[PDB]
Structure 1
Amino acid sequence: SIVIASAARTAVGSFNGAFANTPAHELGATVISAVLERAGVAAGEVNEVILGQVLPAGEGQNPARQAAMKAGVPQEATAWGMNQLCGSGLRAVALGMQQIATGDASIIVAGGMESMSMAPHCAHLRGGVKMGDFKMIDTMIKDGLTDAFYGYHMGTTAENVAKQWQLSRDEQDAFAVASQNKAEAAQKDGRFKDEIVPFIVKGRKGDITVDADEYIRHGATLDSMAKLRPAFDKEGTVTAGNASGLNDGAAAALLMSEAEASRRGIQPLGRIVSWATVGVDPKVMGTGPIPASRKALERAGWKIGDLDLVEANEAFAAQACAVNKDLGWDPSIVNVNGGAIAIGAPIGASGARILNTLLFEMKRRGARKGLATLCIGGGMGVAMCIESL
């Protein structure tokens, strides 16, 4: 009975690019202000802000609260961060919906934010090391991208999936080129304008307005993609080219009850019909969207064939193809404006990022039934079904 009244995201920045020195909570504050403004809802009406964020080390106490306060959400509201890895920004929306469903809140802003650029290096130095070198650990790699059980990068899990579903390097590269070309086309045609709220990077040497997804490559060629070296295995197939990137961004949705939207005269972007999260083997985490989507659709009472549009996260070409083959949905309704291989993947924000892309595309094409889904390090998936009002 819970609708998404509005949504917004920042453009997605390149690693150490547009948002190289912008803390996640600043990106988050801008998206909170935006969902309020887009819905006609004042910050004083917000009850809670819930923001997925995987890499908050060094940012200060509870960045979700910092983002909310900066956006002018009242001190009497509350805010909290959560971490279900790449599933975070979508899971936060489900959690927000549950606040309203249980009657504990009326208006929630939910999503995710991440500054992978700003993630620090670290070391536990309270014990001591009285002689010889020690390791400074990249928190982004360690806490974001390394499997805690097997010790290897998410990219190895992508190889595991490639080997298992027998996906060639050529098939992976074709998929990646296709994502870029879809994203370039959508960007040129203006299809990211609605969802994107511009972010002003404040600087001594001048303010810069960032309103374009900077990671999207224009004129992606299969030839250059085919020449890349495997990035995780000497004899592997996964490359920097057919993998998603490291990125900065934030994304969110304003939630409230359908009844509440009606009183306000709001035309919402959609009704949250169902959601699900399910676990899989950590060695093939990329497959998590399969059981999660199946579970979400079961809960919705929907067949796979009932879906009009799908956003299925593109962590790696390997798993994205695996998911598409197993679920068997029409690939032409999946990521119709491109995916994370082209647009980028700020971890904590990603699931809210693809939700934004889904909502605004559903509205533009008049799609009735949609699904957003992501894989999750450590072996999970999450998925949400949305229906137009």
Structure 2
Amino acid sequence: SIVIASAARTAVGSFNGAFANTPAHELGATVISAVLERAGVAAGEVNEVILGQVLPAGEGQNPARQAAMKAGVPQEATAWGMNQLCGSGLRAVALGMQQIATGDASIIVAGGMESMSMAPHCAHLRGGVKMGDFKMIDTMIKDGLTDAFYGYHMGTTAENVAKQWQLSRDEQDAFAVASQNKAEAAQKDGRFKDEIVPFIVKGRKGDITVDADEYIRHGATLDSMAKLRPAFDKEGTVTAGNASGLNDGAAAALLMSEAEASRRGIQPLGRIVSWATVGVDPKVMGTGPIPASRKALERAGWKIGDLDLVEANEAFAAQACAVNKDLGWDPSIVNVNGGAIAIGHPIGASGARILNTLLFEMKRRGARKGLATLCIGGGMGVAMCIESL
């Protein structure tokens, strides 16, 4: 019944890098337009825009709506943002599918968007500070990467999972290197080109078109990897090298009923067969995808074995290993072109980013059944099953 007509994501920017001063909605605008052009659908025909975005402090009222207008979706349409942290990008798409499934909408653009670079520092100062220093809080750290119940960073959560699953430093380092190697391979081979819509960084002293994921590291070594110090646990195992990065970007999908696509001449990228969200203990939030993936499969009537391709977000090597290990899916069909450790992890947009990767990879290799999953801070997982047409 509901299909993904088309899809597009911007390249993934490094932190304070290519998109350093670009407001997320800008990145979103371009993705909204791309999905529209790629399916031959006019912005005028868009009923609603849903955009997962975790850190919009100071970007003004509802960046989703600013993105939609910037891209030309008429003012008669609607737009909103939502936040299930890292599952935000994928959850948006589910939510948008529900919009058409309940008959409240016909065509929706959904995904996520995030400028981690542009997230401001803040302080509650209405009462006034009579005396003494006060903290200016980094909303990126506090609102997107800190567990709100234990007060520690996501990396600590990953350390909890490493210990629990007995995942050594070498084994998390081995996984990251492979991730970099696969992503680099993919990039050289033109594998990210279909899904990427080039973004124009509007300059003054010149415009700069970005069309390549700049965080991927070329020639990543195991030696350099092994020399890094633990980033969260002083005598820990998680490093800057075996953990995803801080990044900016946007990604989305054009959804509509299979019938509608059919009436249009559009050849969909896939049919949303099912999706699932489930909670877990915040301390081991990286285990989130296990239950969520299984739930989604259950709802689709699929067996783990039925999958031809998987995209399981790499928040941290230790959680990614745990997930694969538990689920037992064939490593070889997971993150075929690299994962977040290489490509980057723009919080609110990462679920839509990985959906794009999955979707263009299923088309190119002809795979039939695919699944995208992500772990979520606070103890949750989100998964989506897709079947090609």
Q: TM-score range by the shorter chain?
A: over 0.9
List structure 1 segments (4+ residues) > 3 angstroms apart after TM superposition: none
- In 2, the alpha carbon distance for the partners of 1:127 and 1:175 equals 49
- What do residues 83-107 of structure 1 show as CA deviations (whole Å, max 9, x unaligned)? 0000000000000000000000000
Structure 2 matches for 1:271-350, cutoff 5 A?
A: 271-350=271-350
- In 2, the alpha carbon distance for the partners of 1:77 and 1:58 equals 24
Q: Deviation at 1:128? A: 1.8
Q: Deviation at 1:151? A: 0.3
- In 2, the alpha carbon distance for the partners of 1:286 and 1:137 equals 25
Please state whether the residue corresponding to 2:44 is helix, strand or coil: helix
- In 1, the alpha carbon distance for the partners of 2:78 and 2:36 equals 16
- What do residues 339-389 of structure 1 show as CA deviations (whole Å, max 9, x unaligned)? 000000000000000000000000000000000000000000000000001
Please state whether the residue corresponding to 1:283 is helix, strand or coil: helix
- What do residues 144-166 of structure 1 show as CA deviations (whole Å, max 9, x unaligned)? 00000000000000000000000
Q: Deviation at 1:32? A: 0.2
- In 1, the alpha carbon distance for the partners of 2:127 and 2:105 equals 44
Q: Deviation at 1:263? A: 0.3
- What do residues 262-293 of structure 1 show as CA deviations (whole Å, max 9, x unaligned)? 00010000000000000000000000000000
Correspondence for 1:55 = 55
Q: Deviation at 1:234? A: 1.2
Q: Deviation at 1:21? A: 0.3
- In 2, the alpha carbon distance for the partners of 1:147 and 1:128 equals 28
- In 1, the alpha carbon distance for the partners of 2:62 and 2:233 equals 37
Structure 2 matches for 1:60-209, cutoff 5 A?
A: 60-209=60-209
- What do residues 76-126 of structure 1 show as CA deviations (whole Å, max 9, x unaligned)? 000000000000000000000000000000000000000000000000000
Q: Deviation at 1:16? A: 0.2
Q: Deviation at 1:143? A: 0.2
- In 2, the alpha carbon distance for the partners of 1:284 and 1:218 equals 31
Q: Aligned residues, how many?
A: 389
- In 1, the alpha carbon distance for the partners of 2:358 and 2:383 equals 12
Please state whether the residue corresponding to 2:255 is helix, strand or coil: strand
RMSD: 0.3
Please state whether the residue corresponding to 2:86 is helix, strand or coil: helix
Correspondence for 2:215 = 215
- In 1, the alpha carbon distance for the partners of 2:233 and 2:270 equals 42
Q: Deviation at 1:43? A: 0.3
- In 2, the alpha carbon distance for the partners of 1:153 and 1:128 equals 29
- In 2, the alpha carbon distance for the partners of 1:218 and 1:344 equals 14
Q: Report the TM-score when normalising by structure 2.
A: 1.00
Q: Deviation at 1:130? A: 1.0
Please state whether the residue corresponding to 1:37 is helix, strand or coil: helix
- In 2, the alpha carbon distance for the partners of 1:12 and 1:387 equals 26
Q: Report the TM-score when normalising by structure 1.
A: 1.00
Q: Deviation at 1:328? A: 0.3
- In 1, the alpha carbon distance for the partners of 2:331 and 2:237 equals 22
- In 2, the alpha carbon distance for the partners of 1:365 and 1:352 equals 20
Q: Which runs of 5+ in 2 are unaligned?
A: none
Q: Which runs of 5+ in 1 are unaligned?
A: none
- What do residues 205-259 of structure 1 show as CA deviations (whole Å, max 9, x unaligned)? 0000000000000010000000000000111000000000000000000000000
Q: Deviation at 1:312? A: 0.1
Q: Deviation at 1:326? A: 0.5
- What do residues 41-85 of structure 1 show as CA deviations (whole Å, max 9, x unaligned)? 000000000000000000000000000000000000000000000
Correspondence for 2:227 = 227
Please state whether the residue corresponding to 1:86 is helix, strand or coil: coil
Q: Which moved more, 1:249-258 or 1:124-133?
A: 124-133
Structure 2 matches for 1:12-51, cutoff 5 A?
A: 12-51=12-51
Q: Deviation at 1:202? A: 0.6
Q: Deviation at 1:131? A: 1.2
- In 2, the alpha carbon distance for the partners of 1:265 and 1:85 equals 35
Q: Deviation at 1:172? A: 0.2
Q: Deviation at 1:127? A: 1.5
Please state whether the residue corresponding to 1:164 is helix, strand or coil: helix
Q: Deviation at 1:324? A: 0.2
- What do residues 16-38 of structure 1 show as CA deviations (whole Å, max 9, x unaligned)? 00000000000000000000000
Please state whether the residue corresponding to 2:87 is helix, strand or coil: helix
Q: Deviation at 1:132? A: 1.3
